[PDB]
Amino acid sequence: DEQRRELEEKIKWKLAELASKSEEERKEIKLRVIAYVLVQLEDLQKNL
Amino acid sequence: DEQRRELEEKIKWKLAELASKSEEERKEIKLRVIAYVLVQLEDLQKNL
Amino acid sequence: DEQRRELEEKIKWKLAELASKSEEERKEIKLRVIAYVLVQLEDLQKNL
Ligand code: NA
Ligand code: NA
Ligand code: NA
């Protein structure tokens, strides 16, 4: 599927961006990711 | 944007909550986050 | 709620799948998860 391939390219681009980040920057990013997913899980746990 | 600032406040609140969790609780939370994102990625990989 | 219980079962199934993965496979999966969430955060940071 087209959209599937586009998503993989978006993911690979983000991985290349992440590769340039320092160890501490990566930890800050991972923390942000965890917090965002948890906010998403809560707001979803409300309507679903 | 308003919604953007609101999201950052939601993320900061979640970060403050995470900061109070023990190391083992944090590992349990990260595991849950990983599993949830993968479920989301699959269900999305179906409609998209 | 029904959908809530279904989500927990989906998450537990994914956790069981993750448990079978090697340490290196788990790192690859976590990297993919981080990149996907960041793509999601960007595309959301555009419409919201
Ligand atoms: Na660099
Ligand atoms: Na504490
Ligand atoms: Na195994």
Residue numbers in the entry:
A (entry chain A), B (entry chain A), C (entry chain A): 4 to 51
Q: What do the authors report?
A:
Deeply knotted proteins, whose topologies may introduce substantial barriers to folding, thus represent an interesting test case for protein design. Here we report our attempts to design proteins with trefoil and pentafoil knotted topologies. We extended previously described algorithms for tandem repeat protein design in order to construct deeply knotted backbones and matching designed repeat sequences (N = 3 repeats for the trefoil and N = 5 for the pentafoil). We developed an approach for designing tandem repeat proteins that fold into a class of knotted topologies known as torus knots.
While kcTRP3c.1 and 3c.2 remained recalcitrant to crystallization, crystals of kcTRP3d.1, 3d.2, and 3d.3 grew readily, and their structures were solved via molecular replacement. kcTRP3d.1 and 3d.3 were phased with the original designed atomic coordinates of kcTRP3d as a molecular probe. Initial molecular replacement runs of kcTRP3d.2 also used kcTRP3d as a probe, however these failed to produce a solution. Only when kcTRP3d was truncated to a single helix-turn-helix equivalent to a single repeating domain (or motif, i.e. one-third of the trefoil) did we obtain a solution, which contained a single repeating subunit sitting on the 3-fold crystallographic axis. Since kcTRP3d.2 sits upon the 3-fold crystallographic axis, only a single repeating motif is present in the asymmetric unit (ASU). To obtain the full trefoil, crystallographic symmetry must be applied however this process averages the three repeating motifs of the trefoil into a single representation as well as averages out any remaining density from the flexible N-terminal affinity tag artifacts. This pseudo-symmetry and averaging are likely the cause of the higher-than-average R-values expected for a structure at this resolution. The kcTRP3d.2 construct crystallized in the intended space group (P213), with lattice dimensions and arrangement of molecules in the crystallographic unit cell that were similar to the lattice design model (55.35 Å vs 55.81 Å), but with differences in the lattice contacts corresponding to a register shift of one helical turn. The crystal structures of kcTRP3d.1–3 validated the accuracies of the designed molecular models and their intended deeply knotted topologies. Superposition of the structures to the original designed atomic coordinates of kcTRP3d produced all-atom rmsd values of 1.84 Å (kcTRP3d.1), 1.43 Å (kcTRP3d.2), and 1.90 Å (kcTRP3d.3).
